[PDB]
Scaffold this active site. Structure first.
Site: not given
Ligand SMILES: Cn1cnc2ccc(-c3cc(N)nc(N)c3)cc21
Ligand SMILES: [Cl-]
Ligand SMILES: [Cl-]
Length: 329
Positions: A17, A21, A90-92, A139
Site C-alpha cells: 500500500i 524511509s 493498523f486498521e485499513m 510530520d
Molecule cells: C496506506 N494505508 C492504508 N491504510 C493504512 C493504515 C496505516 C498506515 C500507516 C500508519 C503509520 N503509523 N505510518 C505509516 N507510514 C502508514 C497506512 C495505511
Molecule cells: Cl520529522
C-alpha cells in the site's frame, strides 16, 4: 515480501500500500479477526527499529485513553516481531489528502469540506495535547492524513515515526519542509504548537490546491513565510539560535532580512488575496458558490492567521480553535 505469503498461521499478504524511509506497508488478511488490515513492516536496522519502538509506545499510550477525541488517530491493533522486522498492524484506511488534492488537479476542495477536515484535525490535536499524552506529531502533512472510506469525509492521522512527547525531543531538524514551523526553522526548542502551524499550512493548501510555503530549502522556506507574515517579532529572534541564518540585527530597526542575489517585501503577499476572500475564492473559481460568502472566507482567514502566529505561546491551541466562529452554525 510477495503476494500470497502466509505468516504465523494468521496473516495473508495481498499487496504493498505504502513505502517509506521506515520500511513498507502492506494490505494483509487477518485470518483470526476475519478482516483486512494494514501491516507497517520496519526495516531490520537499529535506526528505524528504535524510532518504530517509540511510535509503538506512543500509539499504545493513546489506546489507554478511551474518550471521544482519540478516534481521529489510526488505531494500532497490535505489533509483533517477525523475520527480525518490527511489524505494526493498523486498521485499513483509504487514500490520503495529497491524492485527494491530486484528484482535483490541485484546484483544491470546497471551504465546506476544508472545514470538516479542519474540525477533525483540531480534535486530534486537542486529544494529543492531553497532559498525560502531550504528543507532538512532528510530520503533519496532507500525505499523513487518510480518508477512513473513499465515499466519505471522515479522516485519521498516521505516521507517528517522528513523534515525541513534550520534553522527549531527539532531533531539532524535524517536520516536512513545506509544513516546518518558524521555531523549528530558527533552531528553537519545540512544543505541540508546531503541529498547529502545520495544520494552518495544510488547510490553506486543501482549499487553494497548492502549498502555502513551498521553500526549496530552509532559507527559501523562511522567505516564503516572511512574504505573507512579515519579519518575526524581535523577542522571538533575540532568543533564536539560527536567527542569523535568515535575518540580521542592527541598533535602530532591530531586525531585517539577509538579502541574497535578486520574493515580495515582508508581509505584502496578503493571505486575503491568496484565499481570494473578496475575489470569488482561489483563482476566482468559487464565484457565487454557497458557503463561499465573504463572511465565510473572513472567519477562515482569521482562524488561519491565529494558527500561523509566529509566537508559539500565543499561537491558538486546539480547544480555542474548535470554539472559533469558523465552526459556528
Ligand atoms: C496506506 N494505508 C492504508 N491504510 C493504512 C493504515 C496505516 C498506515 C500507516 C500508519 C503509520 N503509523 N505510518 C505509516 N507510514 C502508514 C497506512 C495505511
Ligand atoms: Cl520529522
Ligand atoms: Cl504535499
Amino acid at each position: 515480501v510477495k503476494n500470497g505469503e502466509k505468516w504465523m498461521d494468521r496473516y495473508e499478504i495481498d499487496s504493498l500500500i505504502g513505502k517509506g524511509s521506515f520500511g513498507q506497508v502492506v494490505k494483509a488478511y487477518d485470518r483470526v479477526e476475519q478482516e483486512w488490515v494494514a501491516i507497517k513492516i520496519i526495516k531490520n536496522k537499529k535506526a528505524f527499529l528504535n524510532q518504530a519502538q517509540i511510535e509503538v509506545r506512543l500509539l499504545e499510550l493513546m489506546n489507554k485513553h478511551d474518550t471521544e477525541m482519540k478516534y481521529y488517530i489510526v488505531h494500532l491493533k497490535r505489533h509483533f516481531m517477525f523475520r527480525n522486522h518490527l511489524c505494526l498492524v493498523f486498521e485499513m484506511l483509504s487514500y490520503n489528502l495529497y491524492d485527494l488534492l491530486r484528484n482535483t488537479n490541485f484546484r483544491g476542495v470546497s471551504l465546506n469540506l476544508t472545514r470538516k477536515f479542519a474540525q477533525q484535525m483540531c480534535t486530534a490535536l486537542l486529544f494529543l495535547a492531553t497532559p498525560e499524552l502531550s504528543i507532538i506529531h512532528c510530520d503533519l502533512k496532507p500525505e499523513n492524513i487518510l480518508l477512513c472510506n473513499p465515499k466519505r469525509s471522515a479522516i485519521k492521522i498516521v505516521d507517528f515515526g517522528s513523534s515525541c512527547q513534550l520534553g522527549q525531543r531527539i532531533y531539532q531538524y524535524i517536520q516536512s519542509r513545506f509544513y516546518r514551523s518558524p521555531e523549528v526553522l530558527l533552531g528553537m526548542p519545540y512544543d505541540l504548537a508546531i503541529d498547529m502551524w502545520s495544520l494552518g499550512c495544510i488547510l490553506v493548501e486543501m482549499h487553494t490546491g497548492e502549498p502555502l510555503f513551498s521553500g526549496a530549502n530552509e532559507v527559501d522556506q523562511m522567505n516564503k513565510i516572511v512574504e505573507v507574515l512579515g519579519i518575526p517579532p524581535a523577542h522571538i529572534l533575540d532568543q533564536a539560535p539560527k536567527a542569523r541564518k535568515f535575518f540580521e540585527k542592527l541598533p535602530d530597526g532591530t531586525w531585517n532580512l539577509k538579502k541574497t542575489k535578486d520574493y515580495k517585501p515582508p508581509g505584502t503577499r496578503k493571505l486575503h488575496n491568496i484565499l481570494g476572500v473578496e475575489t470569488g475564492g482561489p483563482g476566482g473559481r468559487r464565484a457565487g458558490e454557497s458557503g463561499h460568502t465573504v463572511a465565510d472566507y473572513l472567519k477562515f482567514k482569521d482562524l488561519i492567521l491565529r494558527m500561523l502566529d509566529y509566537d508559539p505561546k500565543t499561537r491558538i491551541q486546539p480547544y480555542y480553535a474548535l470554539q472559533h466562529s469558523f465552526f459556528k452554525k
